Amino acid sequence: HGGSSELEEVLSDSQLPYFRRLRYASWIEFQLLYRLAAPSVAVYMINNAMSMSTRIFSGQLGNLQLAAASLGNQGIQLFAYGLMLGMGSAVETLCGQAYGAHRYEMLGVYLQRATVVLSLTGIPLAVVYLFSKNILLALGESKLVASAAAVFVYGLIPQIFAYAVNFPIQKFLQSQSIVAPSAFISLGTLFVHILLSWVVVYKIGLGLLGASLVLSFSWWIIVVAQFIYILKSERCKATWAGFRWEAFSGLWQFVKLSAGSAVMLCLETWYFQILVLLSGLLKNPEIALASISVCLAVNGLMFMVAVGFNAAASVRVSNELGAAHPKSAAFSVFMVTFISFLIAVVEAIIVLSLRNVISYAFTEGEVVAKEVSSLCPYLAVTLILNGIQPVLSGVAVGCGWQAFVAYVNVGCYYGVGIPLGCLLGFKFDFGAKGIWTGMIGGTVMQTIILLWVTFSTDWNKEVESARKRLDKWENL
Length: 476
Ligand SMILES: CCCCCCCC/C=C/CCCCCCCC(=O)OC[C@H](O)CO
Hints:
Layout: H1 3-12, H2 18-59, H3 63-87, H4 90-100, H5 107-121, H6 124-130, H7 132-138, H8 143-154, H9 157-175, H10 180-204, H11 207-232, H12 251-281, H13 285-322, H14 326-353, H15 357-362, H16 366-385, H17 389-398, H18 402-427, H19 432-455, H20 459-475
Bound molecules: (2R)-2,3-dihydroxypropyl (9Z)-octadec-9-enoate.
């Protein structure tokens, strides 16, 4: 329980040579990164598999049912997904810093205080789900498609409040460096999800409504399974003191800290969505929509590995800033960035080697395979950029820089990325290469700013700022 972190700090405090000290602080760091990032990827892959399993099981009832599962997941759910996870960012930085400062008693307070805030946030998301039929026909979709997706969206209204409890519990167990139980109950519920969705759809005949209800039901099985763990777990007897009335105090404070990360995700959900819509306005958008969707799907599939390093870099900096280990935090930021950078290099190598094959996997098109292969050099740059940007955003969450990063991300995306992509794409007639270059240029500037800031960071002041943050939340 934080003993390894103390040892790493002790190792840096020695007269031993730099190379001997580097090898033997990297080994203890690499062991901590692996014990955190490996189950984090396994959790997101199994959970997204349920979103794919529900999309697959519901899509086998007709082409209208598949469009309902696709438009419901990417249209309104992806908007509701980024809003719930954004508020769960303040409980991520508060639990990790408190777990490092041995204030285990208030870890359960942050869980409930995040649940109350997220449960109130899921109320505006509920009325949007009810009128999902009206917003789809407003975008021009057919009434039969809008009513079909709404019924599928009607079944996802319990998935909203399931997020409001799963995300605080996820970051709660993440701070204590215990993410293994979450990966195994998700594996079991997936078998329960595939089995129950097969019984509800094929035998009960509830249609696409029951298909989305089984998804929302399975999401509530991992919520109950995660809560009954912390009640019986021995590593959670110091961190979960039980239900407390203090969770209702200082709700607006949790709103202000988490508001930065929430806007960063929903706008980015629209930012990529705007980049797709803008690609439809380019000259010859017939192939620009398919090629960009292939590269972004590869970018999205490669992004699933980056979120594991994001969770690891977040808890490491949080646990070290709370335990007053500034040199260990400056090393964890460096170590996560380097290992994730080498992974992004391997991701770019595989894409460049299979530049002609990856296009046929998503859609069989000969002219599409050429256009995708032409954008693979640009996609490889985005993959390398997506191997440093999320880990620098994860350490910024651990330091509480969520407001500073949100200003930079929105400014680099909407203020720099979008105008550069439209100027290169439309005015300069570079097509999809101009859009992707503008998206690259946006991510480049963001990473550069964060890199200079993070490496010029006074980690002594971040430790003091972590004490002030924990002390103020303890007073109220
Ligand atoms: C849909 C699910 C919703 C889930 C959440 C429902 C409750 C949210 C309400 C909280 C404030 C009102 C209730 C608490 C009123 C007393 C608060 C209190 O003790 O205030 C102390 C004061 O702030 C000095 O420290």
